């Protein structure tokens, strides 16, 4: 009942090859350094998905704050108004409804102070 190793590790290690062929370093060839890079990349992918989340919240709030002080006042007060205006969500993301079309936003700012103030 022979159990000569054969070619399984060939196929599998080379699966790691294509799984990580593209990187830099000897590791971009080296079977055992490459896999360590595979760990690096995937782990990074996880942490970076959540990172991505907060990140995007930021971006929105950035341009939003800019335009809000521009055609009015600080972003915090715009929120305050809209939570009081009860305009559920508006999607701070889609608070980039200022990015395109000035009057949409501007109007909802007048609504912001309209609620409280």
């Amino acid at each position: 009942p022979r159990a000569k190793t054969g070619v399984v590790r060939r196929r599998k290690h080379k699966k790691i090859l294509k799984l990580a062929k593209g990187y830099w370093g000897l590791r971009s060839k080296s079977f055992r350094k490459a896999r360590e890079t595979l760990f690096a990349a995937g782990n990074y992918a996880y942490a970076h998905r959540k990172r991505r989340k907060r990140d995007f919240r930021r971006l929105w709030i950035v341009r939003i704050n800019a335009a809000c002080r521009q055609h009015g006042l600080n972003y915090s007060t715009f929120i305050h108004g809209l939570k009081k205006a009860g305009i559920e969500v508006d999607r701070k993301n889609l608070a980039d409804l200022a990015v395109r079309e000035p009057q949409v936003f501007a109007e909802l700012v007048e609504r912001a102070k309209a609620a409280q103030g």
């Binding site: 950035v62 800019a66 335009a67 521009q70 993301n93 200022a98 990015v99 395109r100």
Partner: protein, 138 residues
């Protein structure tokens, strides 16, 4: 949808006074403009924030005892190469420096963070190279 990314907008130039102003507080404003944080479509990796020509920086105001206290430092790789200069002497000899130092540190550190420093020209005058537009600010 999918957040929008600005096209190659035309950099807008701006002019600022200086005299009577507070150093930090001044730069404080400069920086946020060297970037697009003032513009509604600010973008991180791009550099589209107004150029800023500042006039007569030779007369900027500074609180406390800075004038005699505040000491800038430079280090030549050489032993005992530490060189520290007081805000007092920085004005006398080439003062347009103070405002720059003050700002440079108030901008990102990466490649473009120096790229934006280039967008800022400061003159111990006033007077600038009246290149174009340059709408004075407050």
């Amino acid at each position: 949808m999918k957040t929008y990314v600005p096209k190659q907008v035309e950099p807008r130039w701006v002019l600022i006074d200086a005299e009577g102003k507070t150093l930090g507080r001044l730069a404080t404003k400069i920086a946020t403009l060297l970037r697009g944080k003032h513009r509604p479509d600010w973008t991180p990796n791009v550099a589209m924030g107004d150029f800023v020509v500042v006039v007569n920086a030779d007369k900027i105001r500074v609180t406390g005892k800075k004038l005699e206290q505040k000491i800038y430092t430079r280090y030549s790789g050489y032993p005992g190469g530490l060189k520290k200069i007081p805000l007092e002497k920085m004005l006398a000899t080439h003062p347009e420096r103070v405002l720059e130092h003050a700002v440079k540190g108030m901008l990102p550190k990466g490649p473009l963070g120096r790229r934006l420093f280039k967008r800022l020209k400061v003159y111990a005058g006033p007077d600038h190279p009246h290149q174009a537009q340059r709408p004075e600010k407050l």
